[PDB]
Ligand binder design. Structure first.
Ligand SMILES: c1ccc(-c2ccncc2)cc1
Length: 113
């Protein structure tokens, strides 16, 4: 129960803050199946920040949970596909940690709306 426009502005800013935590930009775009042809064998719903931006603008995020669910998919897909001893797996752990703080603050701002 709030205005749509300020909420989407908040999600756009939050998405930007999450992208800033991904300093290697390993989650900015979909995982390239050209270089990872087996990626879809067990990853049933790939996700990335560019796709999240498309979903945001397509009005697919009308509450904080749905936005946060796709961010969590970025993290969980990466933990699932990659071995624990890789840079990619550790990057997903770090994103989960740093992104979670971004999300908790942004959700507190949405709840004031
Ligand atoms: C090249 C680029 C990205 C990746 C990748 C990134 C994150 N999760 C799985 C694969 C692998 C090879």
């Amino acid at each position: 129960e709030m205005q749509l426009t300020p909420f989407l502005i908040l999600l756009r800013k939050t998405l930007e803050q999450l992208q800033e935590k991904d300093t290697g930009n390993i989650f900015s775009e979909p995982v390239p199946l050209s270089e990872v042809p087996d990626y879809l064998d067990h990853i049933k719903k790939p996700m990335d920040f560019f796709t999240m931006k498309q979903n945001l603008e397509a009005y697919r995020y009308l509450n904080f949970d749905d936005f946060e669910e796709d961010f969590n998919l970025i993290v969980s897909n990466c933990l699932k596909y990659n071995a624990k001893d890789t840079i990619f797996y550790r990057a997903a752990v770090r994103l989960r940690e740093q992104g979670g703080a971004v999300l908790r603050q942004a959700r507190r701002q949405a709840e004031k709306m």
